[PDB]
Design an enzyme around this catalytic site. Structure first.
Site, short mmCIF file in Angstrom:
data_model
loop_
_atom_site.label_atom_id
_atom_site.label_comp_id
_atom_site.label_asym_id
_atom_site.label_seq_id
_atom_site.Cartn_x
_atom_site.Cartn_y
_atom_site.Cartn_z
N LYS A 17 0.85 -1.18 0.00
CA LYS A 17 0.00 0.00 0.00
C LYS A 17 0.89 1.25 0.00
CE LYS A 17 -2.80 -3.44 0.80
NZ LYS A 17 -3.30 -4.18 -0.39
N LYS A 36 10.88 -4.68 3.16
CA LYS A 36 9.59 -3.99 2.97
C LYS A 36 9.90 -2.47 2.96
CE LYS A 36 4.92 -3.51 4.75
NZ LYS A 36 3.85 -4.10 5.58
N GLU A 85 11.96 -11.67 7.64
CA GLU A 85 12.30 -13.05 7.32
C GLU A 85 11.68 -13.27 5.91
OE1 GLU A 85 10.24 -15.83 9.98
OE2 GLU A 85 10.70 -17.53 8.67
N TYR A 86 12.41 -13.89 5.00
CA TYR A 86 11.89 -14.18 3.67
C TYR A 86 11.08 -15.46 3.76
CZ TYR A 86 12.62 -16.41 -1.06
OH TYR A 86 12.49 -17.07 -2.24
N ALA A 87 9.85 -15.43 3.22
CA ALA A 87 8.98 -16.61 3.20
C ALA A 87 9.09 -17.18 1.77
CB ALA A 87 7.56 -16.21 3.52
N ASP A 130 -5.69 -7.77 10.43
CA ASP A 130 -5.60 -7.81 8.97
C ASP A 130 -5.25 -9.23 8.49
OD1 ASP A 130 -6.01 -6.46 6.54
OD2 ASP A 130 -3.92 -5.85 6.33
N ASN A 135 -1.73 -11.88 3.38
CA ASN A 135 -0.88 -11.62 4.56
C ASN A 135 -0.43 -12.89 5.28
OD1 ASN A 135 -2.60 -8.52 5.42
ND2 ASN A 135 -0.90 -8.92 3.98
N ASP A 148 2.50 -9.17 7.91
CA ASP A 148 1.88 -7.86 7.75
C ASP A 148 1.11 -7.39 9.01
OD1 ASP A 148 0.86 -5.51 6.79
OD2 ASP A 148 -0.39 -6.39 5.25
N1 ADP Z 1 8.77 -11.87 3.91
C1 ADP Z 1 8.18 -11.95 2.72
N2 ADP Z 1 8.52 -12.97 1.89
C2 ADP Z 1 7.87 -13.10 0.72
N3 ADP Z 1 6.90 -12.33 0.21
C3 ADP Z 1 6.60 -11.30 1.04
C4 ADP Z 1 7.17 -11.06 2.28
N4 ADP Z 1 6.58 -9.96 2.88
C5 ADP Z 1 5.71 -9.55 1.99
N5 ADP Z 1 5.67 -10.31 0.85
C6 ADP Z 1 4.83 -10.07 -0.33
O1 ADP Z 1 4.61 -8.67 -0.46
C7 ADP Z 1 3.21 -8.37 -0.29
C8 ADP Z 1 3.03 -7.07 0.47
O2 ADP Z 1 3.60 -7.22 1.79
P1 ADP Z 1 2.90 -6.71 3.16
O3 ADP Z 1 3.83 -6.73 4.33
O4 ADP Z 1 1.66 -7.55 3.37
O5 ADP Z 1 2.56 -5.20 2.76
P2 ADP Z 1 1.29 -4.27 2.99
O6 ADP Z 1 1.21 -3.80 4.42
O7 ADP Z 1 1.57 -3.14 2.02
O8 ADP Z 1 0.01 -5.06 2.61
C9 ADP Z 1 2.63 -9.61 0.38
O9 ADP Z 1 1.21 -9.70 0.23
C10 ADP Z 1 3.45 -10.73 -0.27
O10 ADP Z 1 2.95 -10.97 -1.58
O1 T5L Z 2 3.12 -1.37 6.59
C1 T5L Z 2 2.44 -0.55 6.01
O2 T5L Z 2 2.48 -0.34 4.73
C2 T5L Z 2 1.45 0.38 6.69
C3 T5L Z 2 2.05 1.15 7.87
C4 T5L Z 2 1.04 2.16 8.43
C5 T5L Z 2 -0.30 1.51 8.79
C6 T5L Z 2 -0.87 0.69 7.63
C7 T5L Z 2 0.16 -0.33 7.12
C8 T5L Z 2 -0.36 -1.30 6.09
O3 T5L Z 2 -1.04 -0.99 5.12
O4 T5L Z 2 0.00 -2.51 6.39
MG MG Z 3 -0.38 -4.24 5.65
MG MG Z 4 -0.29 -7.05 3.17
#
Ligand code: ADP
Ligand code: T5L
Ligand code: MG
Ligand code: MG
Ligand code: T2F
Length: 259
Positions: A17, A36, A85-87, A130, A135, A148
């Protein structure tokens, strides 16, 4: 203290986002991880900078095999960087898209891993808020990892925040909420893993809202009696009515099909 210069960046792992997540390698150790990357301007614009510190503070203190690790963070003039941590097996979201639906055994296993991670979370009065397929990440052995913590808070919270698909009525109406929010999201996930779509899905936010508020959903014929029972128990308008996680783990359908 870390800087961007300490990591070799790889391909994007997914879209966020407030930025993107990238595969990365720490230069000295060769440690593969996920970075991230969040843009300062967008976080400031949304006024979510406080909430980003909370995502970090909450997640960094969690240690559970079914919860994704946050190792640290750093920032520069334009970006905030979360060291995760990488998934390696990606999201449950992507698995659901290719398989259409999961069998009862795969569903029950995922529900167990989630219930264990959530039990540990709620023990610290941490609400994820969430819990959704995008996630939920997969480790090297295919084990589920809650990721997340962007909307994570300590229970109870009155703090406001689409799509509404995983959100309980109390969160949807801007009311006070507790750990029971994650029990509702668990029921939504169990249904979606078996059916291929969440129980309140709709073409519009307005229609989804009404469905959640009314707890208006039906099961396709292939959904078994045991799966119907657990889902129906989890999706209660009244948060008090929702079962404890202990009861979810000991549910006959969970014990019979997991793991
Ligand atoms: N540690 C990770 N390893 C692999 N893919 C990841 C990892 N973290 C995030 N992702 C990928 O990136 C996307 C966005 O990460 P996320 O932390 O959920 O961000 P946001 O808060 O913007 O939704 C996830 O839905 C997944 O597809
Ligand atoms: O990690 C983020 O991108 C953001 C940080 C601030 C609150 C909302 C959150 C999200 O969408 O998961
Ligand atoms: Mg999020
Ligand atoms: Mg997410
Ligand atoms: C301008 C600025 C700073 C700063 O320079 O002190 C720090 C952050 C920030 C860093 C780390 C974490 Cl975890 C959260 C916020 C953010 C977020 C948006 N603008 C920011």
């Amino acid at each position: 203290q870390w800087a961007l210069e300490d990591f070799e960046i790889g391909r994007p792992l997914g879209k966020g986002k407030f930025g993107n997540v990238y595969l990365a390698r720490e230069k000295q150790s060769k440690f593969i991880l996920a970075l991230k990357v969040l843009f300062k301007a967008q976080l400031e614009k949304a006024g979510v900078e406080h909430q980003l510190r909370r995502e970090v503070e909450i997640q960094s203190h969690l240690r559970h095999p079914n919860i994704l690790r946050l190792y640290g963070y750093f920032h520069d003039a334009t970006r905030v960087y979360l060291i995760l941590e990488y998934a390696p097996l990606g999201t449950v979201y992507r698995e659901l898209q290719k398989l259409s639906k999961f069998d009862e055994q795969r569903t029950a296993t995922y529900i167990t891993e989630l219930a264990n991670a959530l039990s540990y979370c709620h023990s610290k009065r941490v609400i994820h808020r969430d819990i959704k397929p995008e996630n939920l990440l997969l480790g090297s052995a295919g084990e589920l990892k809650i990721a997340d913590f962007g909307w994570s808070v300590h229970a109870p919270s009155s703090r406001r925040t689409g799509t509404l698909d995983y959100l309980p009525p109390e969160m949807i109406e801007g009311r006070m909420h507790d750990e029971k929010v994650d029990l509702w999201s668990l029921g939504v996930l169990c249904y979606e893993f078996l059916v291929g779509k969440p129980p309140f899905e709709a073409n519009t936010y307005q229609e989804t809202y009404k469905r959640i508020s009314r707890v208006e959903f039906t099961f396709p014929d292939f959904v078994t009696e045991g799966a119907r029972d657990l889902i129906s128990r989890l999706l209660k308008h009244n948060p008090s009515q929702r079962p404890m996680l202990r009861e979810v783990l000991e549910h006959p359908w969970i014990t019979a099909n997991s793991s």
